[PDB]
Symmetry: C3
Subunit: 205 residues, 3 copies
């Protein structure tokens, strides 16, 4: 009913108010008091969001990264993703660096964070079908193991990120990097022939 002002998290960060508002509109992170003040409830909501989106540490602090990610998730361009006729469509919003999945006109996987091709390695827009799935793929070019590999376009694929996903300057080299939990879930959910619909443009690419 009312905020618990005694909590074990930091004093409210600069973006507390805007983050609270954004998370409340997402409507999946529990009780939120949109007042710009940190509370036990707001801290729990922020930590839950941070854990889900792989923000490390998940310490409840309403920092710039956490607000930026929350806004990207909230602004995911649902109306810009062309759904394929058959199977599922993996919607890859390059502009917001988010991903969701649709089947038969309904979202079956809610937006999550991704990291796509950095400057010089931009992920090619288009409609691409998954044609290779490997539990772990050895990249001959990059000399690295890529978990939960799903190739959709000439070696551009979905896979578990091998570096911290929120560092924009170290990846990707064309692939769609995913958090471990999301990559595993998508590996189980998606079929051969499902469409990866890549649209927009990653800022700075």
């Amino acid at each position: 009913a009312t905020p618990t002002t005694d909590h074990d998290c930091g004093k409210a960060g600069e973006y507390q108010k805007d983050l609270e508002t954004t998370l409340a509109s997402l409507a999946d992170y529990g009780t939120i008091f949109a007042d710009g003040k940190q509370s036990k409830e707001d801290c729990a909501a922020i930590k839950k969001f941070q854990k889900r989106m792989g923000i490390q540490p998940a310490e409840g602090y309403a920092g710039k990264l956490t607000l930026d990610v929350a806004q990207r998730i909230a602004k995911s361009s649902f109306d810009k993703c062309q759904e394929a006729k058959k199977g599922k469509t993996v919607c890859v919003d390059l502009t917001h660096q988010t991903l969701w999945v649709v089947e038969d006109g309904k979202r079956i996987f809610e937006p999550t964070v991704v990291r796509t091709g950095m400057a010089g390695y931009a992920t090619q827009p288009g409609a691409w079908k998954i044609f290779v799935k490997e539990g772990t793929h050895w990249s001959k070019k990059y000399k690295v193991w890529l978990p939960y590999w799903q190739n959709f376009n000439n070696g551009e694929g979905l896979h578990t990120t091998t570096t911290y996903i929120h560092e924009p300057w170290i990846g990707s080299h064309g692939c769609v990097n995913l958090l471990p939990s999301d990559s595993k879930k998508l590996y189980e959910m998606l079929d051969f022939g499902d469409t990866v619909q890549v649209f927009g443009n990653r800022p700075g690419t």
Copy 2:
């Protein structure tokens, strides 16, 4: 109780009567009126069968291919498949170009369509154990990705067909081609060491 004569399918094809009879004996495609006349019920049954057996389009037309497939399924040589002592036995009837699975004296996977080796590439008869499973196998010989690969004999394996399975002249080159739904299901069901029992002979090979 009685056929619905008003339907959105074509006027009955030449093999309507025989197809209705065959599907009724299969006893898994719903209400059928074995009268040689197309109805809403018979059309639904035929479409369901066509979808299950990967006949494209599944438009409810009692054509030659659909009857031929239905008869192959119905005539699957259950008594010609030697069951292995341990694990499951994948029964590959080369004569009828069908496949089913038995375990502990009972069928756990009902007959489905396959395409095995064409003339010059006939699939070798015998009792063969699955010893390699790959989510996707790259064939070095044929330069193609083969989904849900299960190798049982020197590179002759189960996998998802890469071309329309009902075209007899374009495959296989020795492997047992399967429909996508069936290949995935068999990949999940079958274990290392399960026996692939290949018998009969593909007509024209």
Copy 3:
């Protein structure tokens, strides 16, 4: 309530009494009468244990191997396995040649038998994270397919044993050999980044 003295198993083996006692303490193999006499109940318990631990044949005979395996399972060094902070920890007790799994301070996979590196090929002790998973791995060094491959240290990995696991002189060459049932279960249970904690020393290595 009382032993059924009429059974279809052999006259009691030399280690009947000690095996009965060990299996009773394991407390998962049903009714046991710890009297040194074979019975229908004791035979059933011994066969169940033999089947679970891949002792072939599982004929209910209280032989040396069966007692040795039972004692290894019972003496598994639970307090010697350092649990990792994140994910699951696969505890590999080289001294007892057994394996179990812990998560959040609790065992989620009870001890089973393994075979690790033989003399000259001893499995390296330490804390190692699973970084490659393959349904079947082709060993270039040993020219063999290894099912349910989970690489944790420079090609030392978990996989299904390719030879009878209870023959100490024919393996392994560094890997942790597992029974088929256990390897499949661990392949499904374990994640990338789970820790393989290898400790102790295989006797004679």
